[PDB]
Amino acid sequence: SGPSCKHCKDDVNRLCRVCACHLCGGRQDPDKQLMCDECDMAFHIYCLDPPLSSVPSEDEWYCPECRND
């Protein structure tokens, strides 16, 4: 499954949940978008702005469900 959206061209006028926020799909501090490379799912960490304020991109990161394997 490549990162490209075969169902979304990421138009500037329209926001895509796969390339943006799935929970709200809105523009909010997009630079702080966190996503698990194994999945195209991200976290409301930028929308909610929780104490985490940390980016695990330093190394490969897996979403909580990935580990629930």
Partner: peptide, 12 residues
């Protein structure tokens, strides 16, 4: 990992 900053995109 896959940070994917996501370029700015809105109805703006």
């Amino acid at each position: 990992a896959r940070t994917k900053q996501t370029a700015r995109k809105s109805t703006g």
